[PDB]
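Hi all, posting the design record for the shared folder.

TITLE: backbone redesign
STEP: 1 of 1
STRUCTURE INPUT:
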């Protein structure tokens, strides 16, 4: 099975033991390492950090120590926008120009492929006309890839994509049965089902729902997201169960109603290293002295709380449960966001290096 792990190029700016650079990577940990993120510049693939090209060399240089390892560069992401995408796929010229830069770009820096992270077409200002143009973009990348394979004599560039769980988002711009045919694998983002953008606590990545849920709220969980991807045409071997090494935090209106569904007055206190309210890396959760951990029996994931802080996260156990579930489901593997959010250096949790992802490697392999 596949263990797809994402590296982020902003984790390098974190202070202390949280600073993450390629050297922090374990070559044998995952089967596929994805580099987030690359941007666009005049309909072309481009770097986002003063040192992406140096980082690229260390990233891809890991394949010497592990020749079976596969690397991809992802373009886009949540904070990328849609303009540049909607625009690049508008004319054959731009598509044809993007594609050619993609191939020259990946090869130049030794990437084995490209992971598309257009969040998302047919939404966030994307005319539902982009839904179908996306499909086209896919084939274009696929075709050029299959062709360049022949001419260059090297292995065919891989093509993946980070995809949303939401029925709404899926219908907005994803021709599933079609695009699944051209993607080598699909990175299902089964998280962010809940977060501080809501006025009641809920889990970031629940496997199942709680009895108390039905209707739309019923989909807000992994299994829901998974059936929703299979049913539409995705072959189980190409669907990859994405998992979070981060949880989402809320601030409780009252430190007395600390249950899943309680009143939250907003985001959870920013974490010391991640410094952004409503989210926390697992290593920020780990430590928590004099705190109370619970388990949502229905959704098989935990949560913790101390005073007015409430955070729904993923642990070693819930990860075992999820790999267990994807296995019964016959999914091609697990995807994880992100390497730098796990206690990658055994510096906080006392469970060694990469407690969660090491868990994944073990259960999966
Ligand atoms: C499996 N693919 C996948 N893609 C989605 C990712 O976009 C998303 O992670 C989020 O990506 C944002 C960038 O697109 C991150 O924004 C950065 O946030 C940090 C602070 O928090 C760490 C800022 O300092 C900036 O670096 C900011 N960058 C930009 C360009 O705005 C965001 O942090 C990150 N969120 C998390 C929890 O990691 C994942 C997960 O939802 C999806 O998975």
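Okay, here is what came back for every position:
SEQUENCE:
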């Amino acid at each position: 099975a596949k263990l797809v792990c994402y590296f982020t190029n902003w984790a390098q700016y974190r202070q202390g033991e949280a600073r993450f650079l390629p050297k922090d990577l374990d070559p044998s940990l995952c089967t596929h390492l994805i580099y987030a993120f690359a941007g666009m510049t005049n309909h072309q693939l481009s770097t986002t950090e003063w040192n992406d090209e140096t980082l690229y060399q260390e990233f891809n240089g890991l394949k010497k120590m592990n020749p079976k390892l596969k690397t991809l560069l992802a373009i886009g992401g949540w904070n990328f926008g849609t303009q540049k995408f909607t625009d690049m796929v508008a004319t054959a010229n731009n598509r044809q120009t993007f594609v050619n830069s993609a191939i020259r770009f990946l090869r130049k820096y030794s990437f084995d492929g490209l992971d598309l992270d257009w969040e998302y077409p047919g939404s966030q200002g994307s005319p539902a006309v982009d839904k179908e143009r996306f499909t086209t973009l896919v084939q274009d990348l696929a075709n050029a890839f299959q062709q360049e394979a022949q001419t260059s004599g090297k292995e065919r560039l891989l093509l993946s994509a980070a995809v949303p769980a939401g029925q709404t988002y899926v219908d907005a711009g994803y021709e599933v049965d079609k695009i699944a045919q051209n993607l080598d694998f699909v990175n299902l983002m089964a998280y962010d089902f809940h977060g501080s953008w809501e006025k009641v606590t809920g889990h970031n990545s629940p496997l199942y729902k709680r009895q108390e849920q039905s209707g739309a709220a019923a989909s807000l969980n992994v299994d829901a997201a998974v059936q929703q991807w299979l049913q539409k045409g995705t072959p189980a071997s190409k669907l990859i169960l994405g998992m979070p090494t981060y949880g989402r935090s809320f601030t409780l209106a009252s430190s007395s109603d600390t249950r899943v569904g309680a009143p939250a007055t907003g985001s959870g206190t920013p974490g010391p290293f991640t410094k952004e309210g409503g989210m926390l890396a697992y290593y920020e959760v780990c430590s928590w002295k004099g705190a109370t951990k619970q388990r949502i029996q229905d959704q098989k994931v935990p949560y913790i709380f101390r005073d007015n802080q409430w955070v729904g996260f993923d642990d070693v156990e819930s990860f075992k449960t999820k790999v267990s579930y994807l296995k019964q489901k016959g999914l091609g593997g697990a995807m994880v966001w992100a390497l730098d959010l796990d206690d990658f250096a055994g510096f906080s949790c006392n469970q060694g290096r990469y407690p969660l992802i090491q868990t994944l490697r073990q259960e999966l392999s």
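COMMENT: The CA atoms of residues 274 and 280 lie 7 Å apart.
Let me know if anyone wants the other runs.
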